[PDB]
Design a protein around this ligand. Structure first.
Ligand SMILES: NCc1ccc(C(F)(F)F)cc1
Length: 330
């Protein structure tokens, strides 16, 4: 079997992408943030504290004839930006773009952090990292991808994120019309539970390519590109008037500037991020200072190839017994 679903930016800056997901019988459609950096499927629900819900669509297990309380199971998660949520666990039927999994753990949020509350467009997260990171206790639960793996034609899913435009998540097949050239595959380490790989180097604009190993994770759930301080300094040095701001918390640049492209290496191949992808607009309404899409990972402890990088490519998440990551130009 296969599945295919359209993913849509939640705002004009591509801060995140939402994908419709059908949960329960009869179907309750929620717009979830597909996150290859986490491994929990959690949703706003009828159990969420009422003051913590502001316009989200909620999952109501009592209206689903296939929902089953997973007795005694709880979950609690904290993301790298300080966000947090927790609750109990149901099992139910979950369908993504025609692909159906029965008995999927659906984690019902009783408490959500303020970050999720003030984002009315995101009804929950669908984790697509490895199941070792799932937070359900005492019995760890499998991700949607892991549960679907057996019935998929191929144990892969692909991310084709658009720049200020809709994109596609495909499950079980590789759309050979969605990219140009060849797909370059590279090895994945699962030791930390992430889609972790090693980039072979970088270049700024039309400058020389610097061969150097950059270990990082492919994370559709992170907006920006977080790279070591040496790389990020070399990039912003080429932008007149750019500077690292302590009050803003990162590199800003004059909105009048034009940004150079950024190239990262995948084996012997190169993926070019257009300079326009790195512009995240004024730091405040009316400001002439703009926020940069490439920031330092020094405060995070891990390099993150977020949406800024992934939307420049067609990305294959190959969940075979030896997992690999595929990158192609598009
Ligand atoms: N997108 C999920 C996510 C968020 C943060 C991290 C961090 F901070 F631990 F690297 C990993 C994964």
């Amino acid at each position: 079997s296969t599945g295919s679903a359209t993913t849509t930016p939640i705002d004009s800056l591509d801060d995140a992408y939402i994908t419709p997901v059908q949960i329960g019988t009869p179907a309750q459609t929620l717009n979830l943030d597909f996150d290859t950096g986490s491994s929990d499927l959690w949703v706003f629900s009828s159990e969420t504290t009422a003051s913590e819900v502001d316009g989200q669509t909620i999952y109501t297990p009592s209206k689903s004839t296939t929902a089953k309380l997973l007795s005694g199971a709880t979950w609690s998660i904290s993301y790298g930006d300080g966000s947090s949520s927790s609750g109990d666990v149901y099992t139910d039927t979950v369908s993504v773009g025609g692909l159906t999994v029965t008995g999927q753990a659906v984690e019902s949020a009783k408490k959500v952090s303020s970050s999720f509350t003030e984002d009315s467009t995101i009804d929950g997260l669908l984790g697509l990292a490895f199941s070792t990171l799932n937070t359900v206790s005492p019995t760890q639960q499998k991700t949607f991808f892991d549960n679907a793996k057996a019935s998929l034609d191929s144990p892969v899913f692909t991310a084709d994120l658009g720049y200020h435009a809709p994109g596609t998540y495909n499950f079980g097949f590789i759309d050979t019309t969605a990219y140009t050239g060849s797909i370059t595959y590279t090895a994945v380490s699962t030791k930390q539970g992430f889609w972790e790989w090693t980039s072979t180097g970088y270049a700024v604009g039309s400058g020389t390519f610097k061969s150097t190993s950059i270990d990082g994770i492919a994370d559709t759930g992170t907006t920006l590109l977080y790279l070591p301080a040496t790389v990020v300094s070399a990039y912003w040095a080429q932008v007149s008037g750019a500077k690292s701001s302590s009050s803003v918390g990162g590199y800003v640049f004059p909105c009048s500037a034009t940004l150079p492209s950024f190239t990262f290496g995948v084996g012997s191949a190169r993926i070019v991020i257009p300079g326009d992808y790195i512009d995240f607009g004024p730091i405040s309404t009316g400001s002439s200072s703009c926020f940069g899409g490439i920031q330092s990972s020094a405060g995070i402890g891990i390099n993150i190839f977020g949406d800024v990088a992934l939307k420049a490519a067609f990305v294959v998440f190959n969940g075979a017994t030896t997992p690999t990551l595929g990158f192609a130009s598009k």
